[PDB]
Amino acid sequence: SNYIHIRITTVQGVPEEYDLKRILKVLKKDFACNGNIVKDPEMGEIIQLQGDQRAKVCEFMISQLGLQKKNIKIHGF
Amino acid sequence: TSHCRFYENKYPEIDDIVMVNVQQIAEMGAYVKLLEYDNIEGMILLSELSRRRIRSIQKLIRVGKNDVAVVLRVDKEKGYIDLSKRRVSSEDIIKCEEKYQKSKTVHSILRYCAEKFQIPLEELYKTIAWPLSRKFGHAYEAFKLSIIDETVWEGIEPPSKDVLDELKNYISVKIRADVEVSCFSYEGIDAIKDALKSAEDVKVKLVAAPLYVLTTQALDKQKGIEQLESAIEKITEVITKYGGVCNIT
Amino acid sequence: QATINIGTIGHVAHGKSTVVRAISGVQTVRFKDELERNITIKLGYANAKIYKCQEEISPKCQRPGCPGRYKLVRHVSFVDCPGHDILMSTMLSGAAVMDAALLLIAGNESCPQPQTSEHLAAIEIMKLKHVIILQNKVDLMREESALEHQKSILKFIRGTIADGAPIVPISAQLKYNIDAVNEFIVKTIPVPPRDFMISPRLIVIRSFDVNKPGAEIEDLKGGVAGGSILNGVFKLGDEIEIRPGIVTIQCKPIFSNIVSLFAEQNDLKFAVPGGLIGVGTKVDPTLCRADRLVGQVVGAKGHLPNIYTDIEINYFLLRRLLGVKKQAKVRKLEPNEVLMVNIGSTATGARVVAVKADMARLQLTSPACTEINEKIALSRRIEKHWRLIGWATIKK
RNA sequence: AGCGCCGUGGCGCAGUGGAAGCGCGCAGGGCUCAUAACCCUGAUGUCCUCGGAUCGAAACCGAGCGGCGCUACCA
Numbered sequence: 141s142n143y144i145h146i147r148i149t150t151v152q153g154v155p156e157e158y159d160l161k162r163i164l165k166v167l168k169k170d171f172a173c174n175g176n177i178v179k180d181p182e183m184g185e186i187i188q189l190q191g192d193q194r195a196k197v198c199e200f201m202i203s204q205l206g207l208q209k210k211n212i213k214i215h216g217f
Numbered sequence: 218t219s220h221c222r223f224y225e226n227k228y229p230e231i232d233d234i235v236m237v238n239v240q241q242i243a244e245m246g247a248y249v250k251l252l253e254y255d256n257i258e259g260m261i262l263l264s265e266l267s268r269r270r271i272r273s274i275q276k277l278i279r280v281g282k283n284d285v286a287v288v289l290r291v292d293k294e295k296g297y298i299d300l301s302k303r304r305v306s307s308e309d310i311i312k313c314e315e316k317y318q319k320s321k322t323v324h325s326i327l328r329y330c331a332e333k334f335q336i337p338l339e340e341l342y343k344t345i346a347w348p349l350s351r352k353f354g355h356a357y358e359a360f361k362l363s364i365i366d367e368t369v370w371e372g373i374e375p376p377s378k379d380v381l382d383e384l385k386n387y388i389s390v391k392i393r394a395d396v397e398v399s400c401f402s403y404e405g406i407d408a409i410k411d412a413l414k415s416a417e418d419v420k421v422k423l424v425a426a427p428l429y430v431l432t433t434q435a436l437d438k439q440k441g442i443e444q445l446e447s448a449i450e451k452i453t454e455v456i457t458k459y460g461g462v463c464n465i466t
Numbered sequence: 467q468a469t470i471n472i473g474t475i476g477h478v479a480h481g482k483s484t485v486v487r488a489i490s491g492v493q494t495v496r497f498k499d500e501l502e503r504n505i506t507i508k509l510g511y512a513n514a515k516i517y518k519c520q521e522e523i524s525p526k527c528q529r530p531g532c533p534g535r536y537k538l539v540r541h542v543s544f545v546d547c548p549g550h551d552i553l554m555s556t557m558l559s560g561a562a563v564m565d566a567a568l569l570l571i572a573g574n575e576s577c578p579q580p581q582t583s584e585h586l587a588a589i590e591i592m593k594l595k596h597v598i599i600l601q602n603k604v605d606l607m608r609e610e611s612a613l614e615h616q617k618s619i620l621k622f623i624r625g626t627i628a629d630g631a632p633i634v635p636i637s638a639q640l641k642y643n644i645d646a647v648n649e650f651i652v653k654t655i656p657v658p659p660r661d662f663m664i665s666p667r668l669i670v671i672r673s674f675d676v677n678k679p680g681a682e683i684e685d686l687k688g689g690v691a692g693g694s695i696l697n698g699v700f701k702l703g704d705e706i707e708i709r710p711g712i713v714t715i716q717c718k719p720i721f722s723n724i725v726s727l728f729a730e731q732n733d734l735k736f737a738v739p740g741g742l743i744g745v746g747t748k749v750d751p752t753l754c755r756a757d758r759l760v761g762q763v764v765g766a767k768g769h770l771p772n773i774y775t776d777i778e779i780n781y782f783l784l785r786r787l788l789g790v791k792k793q794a795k796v797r798k799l800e801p802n803e804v805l806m807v808n809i810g811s812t813a814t815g816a817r818v819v820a821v822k823a824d825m826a827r828l829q830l831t832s833p834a835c836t837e838i839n840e841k842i843a844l845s846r847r848i849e850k851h852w853r854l855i856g857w858a859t860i861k862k
Numbered sequence: 863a864g865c866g867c868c869g870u871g872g873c874g875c876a877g878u879g880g881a882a883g884c885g886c887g888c889a890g891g892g893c894u895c896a897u898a899a900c901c902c903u904g905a906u907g908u909c910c911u912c913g914g915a916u917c918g919a920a921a922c923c924g925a926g927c928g929g930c931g932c933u934a935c936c937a
């Protein structure tokens with residue numbers, strides 16, 4: 141499990157090993173985009189940032205906790 | 218014929234809460250039928266329509282559905298209903314939902330007879346509704362008491378018993394409890410078998426070695442609790458003497 | 467039933483469960499939803515068939531080509547023991563249980579595999595010397611690589627306690643050259659003297675909780691446990707006591723009566739010792755639910771096992787540490803250090819009160835029973851988990 | 863191997879007991895000079911199958927079906 145995907149952009153599937161508000165704090169400044177933590181009931185926790193920066197989202201997910209980079213399959217869309 | 222209003226009289230009372238069905242919108246608001254009271258049209262005005270500001274109208278009314286609202290004024294002379302959607306308490310919305318569902322169940326129940334025996338639905342419902350709604354509460358509790366012990370249908374004579382027999386034919390709660398065995402005795406399985414033989418002769422089953430889960434099919438919601446505590450105390454009495462200890466939480 | 471106990475040891479990610487499956491045929495469950503892929507916790511079990519054809523998996527032989535079938539010769543049990551660093555106490559329990567050994571050595575990996583050598587030392591600790599070296603990987607080697615590995619195994623194992631170790635090629639997938647394994651097991655490994663002379667005892671190594679869920683409780687089975695007998699035959703209709711018992715820190719004995727004795731396929735009234743047997747008694751299944759009946763010394767009524775807390779032990783340590791590819795010298799014991807002292811099968815870390823160069827006094831938190839010898843193993847806390855340092859024996 | 867959930871429109875829910883359910887979606891159109899936003903209409907199906915009661919059923923139940931949580935491998 142623990143699958144993660146990015147859909148035009150929301151990130152569905154996020155490990156809980158670090159606090160969410162600091163993730164938002166680093167995200168907004170390193171992307172320069174509006175950031176939302178939307179907690180829909182019992183779906184993959186929603187973190188939404190504007191623009192088409194999936195390469196930059198890759199950079200962020202590498203720089204936050206990511207060390208696998210193999211279960212990430214971003215849908216183009 | 219879906220007719221013959223659920224409650225005592227055809228014409229709604231004052232300041233009463235309803236749920237309504239939408240059919241059309243001319244230009245001002247919508248005069249739409251009601252499935253909480255008699256099917257006389259009740260009209261909603263746009264001033265009393267949307268808690269949010271009026272910019273889209275087809276998404277908040279959703280023509281052809283059920284919506285909670287409250288009737289302000291009623292015209293019982295020739296039939297006009299002034300109906301309001303906004304001033305409804307967030308806790309009374311649940312009241313409207315449950316009352317509408319209860320009336321829907323009553324409508325569903327007293328249609329089977331009218332269609333099986335092709336007699337007037339209005340006549341049969343008029344005969345049945347005197348002990349039904351006005352006794353001390355809704356019909357569903359009376360119907361459940363009657364299926365467990367028939368006493369409500371006999372309050373007044375129906376047109377016949379074949380229709381009531383069809384009702385009974387169509388109509389024809391589990392409580393959980395956990396018991397954890399903390400036994401350190403040598404022979405403690407025989408005590409469990411004996412106690413469960415005594416208790417079962419309602420449904421007690423197994424999950425784990427110390428865990429015994431009883432799911433009693435109670436009929437009164439309070440008889441099940443007392444049988445549950447009786448079984449628990451029987452377990453404790455049997456098990457605290459032969460050498461072991463058990464606990465229930 | 468089973469006549470002699472046999473076990474298999476190997477390094478991690480080496481392959482022994484499927485090897486025994488190709489030897490015996492009984493699936494290793496490897497349950498609890500996390501043991502399926504990393505390591506196991508409870509012991510694996512299997513049963514082998516030995517009908518030897520003297521002109522095999524089945525009592526009737528058709529594969530050799532001649533319609534002659536095989537006759538009953540031996541039926542040996544197999545106790546799969548996990549060779550990993552995390553768990554050692556159950557490894558030592560099974561090691562005291564087993565009588566015959568099968569060691570795995572991996573070719574292309576590092577020829578000294580630390581767990582293989584560590585468990586070979588454990589084998590040599592508890593009077594096990596009939597060991598057959600098995601090359602667990604054969605297809606994955608060249609001929610020259612196989613020759614190099616043969617010479618490496620020979621040069622590495624020359625002067626150890628286990629000197630006469632025949633070598634056998636096996637795999638987990640092919641299922642061939644298997645009759646050689648059975649032949650060498652029958653030949654090199656005899657059944658140790660086990661007859662009616664010595665008084666009966668039992669050693670229980672596992673706990674089975676038998677309570678069929680969903681079924682009506684009015685008819686349930688009691689508590690069944692896996693046990694090994696180093697002396698005497700157990701018969702139905704006897705009163706038995708689980709001596710390490712229950713905690714009321716202090717412990718007190720458990721008494722019970724035998725209900726059934728599952729013997730390798732069914733319930734047999736008598737059972738010659740030397741094999742794992744399922745003793746099903748009136749004991750409470752909760753006492754058999756968790757890892758409770760793991761390493762408990764059990765007595766037939768008519769004997770009085772002695773419960774001890776202070777134990778005087780003759781112990782000896784080897785020169786170097788075991789189980790590491792850095793290594794350090796063996797250091798002499800220091801007072802007030804909790805050291806695990808496994809009395810054949812028990813799992814209880816004792817405190818050291820008296821220190822001598824070849825003698826010691828140790829106090830167990832949980833008291834344990836002592837009957838005659840009950841050989842022991844000694845493990846310390848050095849490499850962030852339990853590391854073998856030597857062997858121990860009760861002397862009082 | 864048991865009991866409790868899921869039972870798809872590409873999707874999560876939604877009522878389950880009057881028959882095609884919401885938003886997310888995607889296509890087109892509207893808005894504006896133009897875009898985003900905003901405003902409309904759409905095509906998506908066996909809410910897995912078997913029955914029963916049922917004028918009426920995907921629903922209410924029941925006797926099998928594909929996956930999930932525990933018991934914990936329950937000799």
Ligand SMILES: Nc1nc2c(ncn2[C@@H]2O[C@H](COP(=O)(O)OP(=O)(O)CP(=O)(O)O)[C@@H](O)[C@H]2O)c(=O)[nH]1
Binds near residue numbers: 478483506547550636
């Ligand atoms: N090709 C090949 N693969 C093997 C062989 N032996 C084991 N394996 C591999 O080992 C893996 C699991 O085997 P298994 O015996 O169940 O593991 P294990 O021996 O219990 C691990 P541990 O010894 O630490 O307890 C399989 O994926 C298998 O491919 C072998 O001889 N040949």
Ligand SMILES: [Mg+2]
Binds near residue numbers: 546
């Ligand atoms: Mg196993």
Ligand SMILES: [Zn+2]
């Ligand atoms: Zn394969």
